[PDB]
Amino acid sequence: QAELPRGCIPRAVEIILRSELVETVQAGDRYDFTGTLIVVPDYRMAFLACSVQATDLPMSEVTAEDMKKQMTDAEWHKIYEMSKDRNLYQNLISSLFPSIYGNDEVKRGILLQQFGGVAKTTTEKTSLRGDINVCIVGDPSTAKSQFLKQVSDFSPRAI
Amino acid sequence: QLVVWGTNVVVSQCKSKFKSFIMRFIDPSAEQDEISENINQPLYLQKLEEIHTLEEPYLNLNCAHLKTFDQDLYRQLICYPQEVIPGFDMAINEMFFERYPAALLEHQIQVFNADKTRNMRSLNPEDMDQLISISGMVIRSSNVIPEMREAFFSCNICSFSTTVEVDRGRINQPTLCTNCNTNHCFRLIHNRSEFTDKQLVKLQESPDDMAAGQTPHNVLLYAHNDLVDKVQPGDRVTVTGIYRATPLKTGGLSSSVKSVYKTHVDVVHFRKFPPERVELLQLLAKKPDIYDRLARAIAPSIYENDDIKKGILLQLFGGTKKKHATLGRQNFRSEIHLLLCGDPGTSKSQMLQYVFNLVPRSQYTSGRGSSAVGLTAYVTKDPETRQLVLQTGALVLADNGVCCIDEFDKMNDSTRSVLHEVMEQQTLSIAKAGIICQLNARTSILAAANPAESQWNKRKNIIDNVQLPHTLLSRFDLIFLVLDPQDEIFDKRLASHLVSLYYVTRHEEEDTMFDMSVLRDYIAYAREHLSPTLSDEAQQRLIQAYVDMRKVGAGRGQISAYPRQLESLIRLSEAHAKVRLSNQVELLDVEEAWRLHREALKQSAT
Amino acid sequence: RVSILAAANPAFGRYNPRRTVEQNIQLPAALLSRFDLLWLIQDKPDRDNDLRLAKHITYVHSHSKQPPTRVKALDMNLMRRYINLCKRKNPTIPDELTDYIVGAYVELRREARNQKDMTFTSARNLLGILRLSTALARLRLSDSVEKDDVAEALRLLEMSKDSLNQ
DNA sequence: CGTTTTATTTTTTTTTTTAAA
Numbered sequence: 001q002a003e004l005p006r007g008c009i010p011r012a013v014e015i016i017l018r019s020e021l022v023e024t025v026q027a028g029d030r031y032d033f034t035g036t037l038i039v040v041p042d043y044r045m046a047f048l049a050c051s052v053q054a055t056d057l058p059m060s061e062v063t064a065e066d067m068k069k070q071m072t073d074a075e076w077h078k079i080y081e082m083s084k085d086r087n088l089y090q091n092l093i094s095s096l097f098p099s100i101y102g103n104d105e106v107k108r109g110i111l112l113q114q115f116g117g118v119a120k121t122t123t124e125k126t127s128l129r130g131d132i133n134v135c136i137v138g139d140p141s142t143a144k145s146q147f148l149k150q151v152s153d154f155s156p157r158a159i
Numbered sequence: 160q161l162v163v164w165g166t167n168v169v170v171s172q173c174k175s176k177f178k179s180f181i182m183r184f185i186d187p188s189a190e191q192d193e194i195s196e197n198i199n200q201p202l203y204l205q206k207l208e209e210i211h212t213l214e215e216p217y218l219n220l221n222c223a224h225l226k227t228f229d230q231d232l233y234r235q236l237i238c239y240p241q242e243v244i245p246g247f248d249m250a251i252n253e254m255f256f257e258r259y260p261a262a263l264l265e266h267q268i269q270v271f272n273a274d275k276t277r278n279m280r281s282l283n284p285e286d287m288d289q290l291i292s293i294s295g296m297v298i299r300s301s302n303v304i305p306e307m308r309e310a311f312f313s314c315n316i317c318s319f320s321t322t323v324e325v326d327r328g329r330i331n332q333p334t335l336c337t338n339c340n341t342n343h344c345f346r347l348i349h350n351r352s353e354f355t356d357k358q359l360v361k362l363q364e365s366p367d368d369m370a371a372g373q374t375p376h377n378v379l380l381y382a383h384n385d386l387v388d389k390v391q392p393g394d395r396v397t398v399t400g401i402y403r404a405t406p407l408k409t410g411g412l413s414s415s416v417k418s419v420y421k422t423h424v425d426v427v428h429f430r431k432f433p434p435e436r437v438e439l440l441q442l443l444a445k446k447p448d449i450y451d452r453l454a455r456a457i458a459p460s461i462y463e464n465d466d467i468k469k470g471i472l473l474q475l476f477g478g479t480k481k482k483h484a485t486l487g488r489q490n491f492r493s494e495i496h497l498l499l500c501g502d503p504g505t506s507k508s509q510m511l512q513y514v515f516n517l518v519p520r521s522q523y524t525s526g527r528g529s530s531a532v533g534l535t536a537y538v539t540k541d542p543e544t545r546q547l548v549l550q551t552g553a554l555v556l557a558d559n560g561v562c563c564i565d566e567f568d569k570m571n572d573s574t575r576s577v578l579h580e581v582m583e584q585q586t587l588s589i590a591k592a593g594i595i596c597q598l599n600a601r602t603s604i605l606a607a608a609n610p611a612e613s614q615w616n617k618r619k620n621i622i623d624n625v626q627l628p629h630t631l632l633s634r635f636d637l638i639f640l641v642l643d644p645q646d647e648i649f650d651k652r653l654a655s656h657l658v659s660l661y662y663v664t665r666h667e668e669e670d671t672m673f674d675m676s677v678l679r680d681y682i683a684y685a686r687e688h689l690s691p692t693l694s695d696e697a698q699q700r701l702i703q704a705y706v707d708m709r710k711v712g713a714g715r716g717q718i719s720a721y722p723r724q725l726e727s728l729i730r731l732s733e734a735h736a737k738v739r740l741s742n743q744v745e746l747l748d749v750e751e752a753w754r755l756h757r758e759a760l761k762q763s764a765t
Numbered sequence: 766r767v768s769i770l771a772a773a774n775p776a777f778g779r780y781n782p783r784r785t786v787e788q789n790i791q792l793p794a795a796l797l798s799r800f801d802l803l804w805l806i807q808d809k810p811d812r813d814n815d816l817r818l819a820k821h822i823t824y825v826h827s828h829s830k831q832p833p834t835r836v837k838a839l840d841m842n843l844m845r846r847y848i849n850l851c852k853r854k855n856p857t858i859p860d861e862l863t864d865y866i867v868g869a870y871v872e873l874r875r876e877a878r879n880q881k882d883m884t885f886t887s888a889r890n891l892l893g894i895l896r897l898s899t900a901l902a903r904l905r906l907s908d909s910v911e912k913d914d915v916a917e918a919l920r921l922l923e924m925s926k927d928s929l930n931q
Numbered sequence: 932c933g934t935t936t937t938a939t940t941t942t943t944t945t946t947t948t949t950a951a952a
């Protein structure tokens with residue numbers, strides 16, 4: 001989907017892989033394959049590859065510090081100013097949809113949807129759960145689908 | 160006299176005759192026959208300039224110039240044409256040295272385009288190995304299938320790693336390969352060799368000469384290695400080619416063969432900027448008559464409420480985007496769509512037919528004759544193993560084209576509600592159990608909307624009339640009225656004009672000059688190297704007048720605007736700037752909106 | 766490319782005079798506009814009417830060929846062949862009609878509007894009254910669309926109407 | 932101068948279509 005043409009469709013092509021490459025693939029990811037196109041000795045075409053390149057070592061706003069793991073959350077030193085100063089919430093109300101305006105309740109509420117829920121330590125007799133059922137309505141001509149579309153850029157599995 | 164046993168053709172005659180013809184060549188159209196035309200050198204030498212200097216290989220060239228020269232060349236080229244055509248390429252590959260001897264003479268050319276056809280319906284034994292060219296509309300978009308040409312061998316002892324290409328199908332076997340001492344037996348493997356590409360898509364003939372109550376009969380052929388996805392599929396196109404035939408494997412128990420031969424056509428070619436005349440380009444922009452002059456051209460004969468030719472003003476000097484190179488967000492596409500509403504049998508197809516008869520992206524549609532779901536490429540049964548593919552949708556193959564739609568409040572709820580998003584989003588989420596994606600396509604829309612009634616019932620503001628609410632009935636900028644002037648006054652005019660269109664037996668070239676093609680090129684220049692901006696001038700108007708836009712909203716049975724049509728206004732801003740010569744925004748353009756809008760928007764009396 | 770033949774029956778009743786056109790009928794205007802001519806056929810009790818029609822019918826019941834001694838009958842072959850000689854005239858409609866006919870059309874459009882509970886009109890009304898006349902010159906076989914060519918056009922149009930009240 | 936050839940049926944899901952007071 002980084003490559004997308006007019007008219008034409010992401011047509012389908014078929015491939016095999018080795019033991020260490022095997023069953024190490026999940027939903028919609030961006031990997032680097034190998035261009036070893038090969039024939040069918042039926043003919044028709046096929047192809048083949050041998051190499052892929054699809055959070056202990058840290059994400060963006062860092063450089064290496066210490067944590068529970070190597071750099072899983074190491075950069076407390078810079079996070080923590082933006083962790084506790086509870087007006088930071090207003091950044092999370094303001095500094096996240098600056099190109100957009102609506103109600104200010106959604107823009108202060110969605111975040112915990114994105115973020116983990118409960119995940120407690122209790123029964124086998126019954127499950128307890130974290131996430132929640134959710135909605136949004138109104139009527140159109142009110143900018144009520146910009147946000148959903150943006151999530152696909154914002155967050156993972158924002159399908 | 161050196162010839163195939165069963166023929167009458169020779170390389171040297173056609174070669175020399177054509178080399179003399181291209182030496183009998185200054186553009187024989189534009190320098191011998193059409194001496195009133197003029198580009199004065201043999202064009203192919205000129206091209207060997209304008210190909211080599213262009214460094215832009217794989218020429219395209221016809222041979223209908225050859226009617227003046229000796230026609231025996233024409234005939235023996237018509238009839239024996241896979242055995243003379245390379246000879247004419249050899250003459251060209253000789254012509255290389257006429258103009259550049261010591262070039263990088265390592266590339267070849269591609270290539271006819273002269274002979275006739277009438278139709279595909281009925282051909283004959285005579286017409287077996289002959290030149291043909293026919294046309295229609297394309298159906299499919301195929302994949303590729305390559306084809307082999309050579310064997311790369313192996314060995315057992317001392318590396319007798321031989322090789323050899325194919326005539327078309329055999330390799331020989333003495334006890335070793337190219338029998339080299341036979342240290343081992345014969346060897347072969349089939350990959351490190353020469354392969355060749357092709358596809359297959361068929362055509363639907365679609366002329367005005369289609370015989371009475373007759374079905375589609377349709378034809379098809381492969382490609383060659385450069386003639387492979389030249390093709391945004393599905394439009395009005397011609398081909399050249401050579402009628403081909405093939406026997407067929409009877410049954411399938413064993414090598415029995417059929418009596419009947421299948422046929423298709425050989426695979427050759429298909430059919431579809433000037434600094435000279437810069438003068439009139441600027442001349443027409445600075446002429447304030449753009450409002451009507453070209454609009455006066457479009458309907459050739461019809462004034463039919465020529466405030467609709469000023470509605471044709473809406474439409475061309477091509478349509479600029481405010482794409483979002485700065486921030487990258489939001490994908491704000493500058494789409495355009497309007498309808499032509501009903502309650503009188505007006506020209507709400509005829510214009511749409513004029514268009515489709517002119518624009519190649521040509522389709523006509525309406526309710527209850529087809530499905531809402533014709534984006535499916537149905538797998539009713541396939542030539543596959545139920546690898547269920549939905550190859551290509553139909554209604555969406557109009558890439559920036561048009562499908563004409565008629566009689567719009569005709570279908571069920573699912574139809575025509577299903578499209579509540581594509582209009583200004585051009586996405587089609589294929590979220591079914593089969594293969595999945597988020598595709599792209601965007602184009603133009605026009606139809607002949609109709610309420611529940613034949614005539615607009617009087618006494619009754621328009622929001623009541625169509626059965627859509629004051630969100631969806633009042634949706635667009637304006638969805639434009641089409642009334643009868645309630646009197647004889649307008650009625651007799653176009654009668655008096657075009658009663659005699661049979662009986663006029665002529666056409667008048669007036670000061671509203673019927674532009675044969677001098678119109679059709681300027682628009683193609685209309686988008687190239689000036690780029691409409693929007694600064695600080697022409698936007699405060701409905702920034703401020705949104706007061707006037709929306710404060711008529713206090714009211715039920717009246718209607719105000721909603722915030723997608725302001726988008727339609729900023730999209731209106733794009734066109735008029737370059738032409739009339741300020742690519743930065745001028746302010747008058749919004750009046751055109753009020754010239755358009757309140758023509759049926761402040762017609763909100765009650 | 767098919768010429769179209771529409772034939773139907775009135776609604777509940779047989780043209781109940783109280784239930785008016787599209788009061789007694791239930792058909793959208795969109796199809797009537799596509800139709801050149803709409804024709805209601807009712808013949809109320811006429812003491813003398815059905816007589817002739819009866820004896821006429823019974824003639825081919827006592828006999829096999831109805832019409833004696835008023836015309837030379839034309840077989841399917843002869844009929845078709847004579848018709849075969851007709852359509853390729855492409856006749857002449859001289860220029861005075863163009864100004865004249867556009868005037869006569871207006872005569873309709875006024876007596877259409879002078880009653881307000883009346884039929885709507887499409888451009889095909891004028892296109893039709895144009896369309897019919899030049900055809901009939903094919904069977905006149907003289908390339909001479911003239912006054913009678915359209916006076917019969919309007920005549921038959923008028924007979925299409927003004928038949929249900931009186 | 933000898934010794935051998937050849938068959939498939941029911942169920943899915945889509946897109947079509949069709950039913951009652």
Ligand SMILES: Nc1ncnc2c1ncn2[C@@H]1O[C@H](COP(=O)(O)OP(=O)(O)OP(=O)(O)O)[C@@H](O)[C@H]1O
Pocket residue numbers: 099100101102103139140141142143144145146580722723
């Ligand atoms: N507070 C706001 N912030 C940003 N944009 C706004 C705001 N209010 C209105 N708009 C604009 O109004 C327009 C409303 O039309 P829009 O394209 O959103 O339809 P839509 O909401 O996508 O319809 P649907 O959600 O039903 O698909 C939006 O494009 C949006 O840019």
Ligand SMILES: Nc1ncnc2c1ncn2[C@@H]1O[C@H](COP(=O)(O)OP(=O)(O)OP(=O)(O)O)[C@@H](O)[C@H]1O
Pocket residue numbers: 461462463464500501502503504505506507508509565566607608609653795888889
């Ligand atoms: N001023 C005019 N000039 C030329 N043609 C006209 C004019 N007014 C009406 N017509 C004709 O009237 C016809 C209207 O019918 P058409 O077949 O387009 O109907 P339609 O728009 O599909 O009808 P509806 O939308 O009500 O179903 C056109 O073919 C057109 O030729």
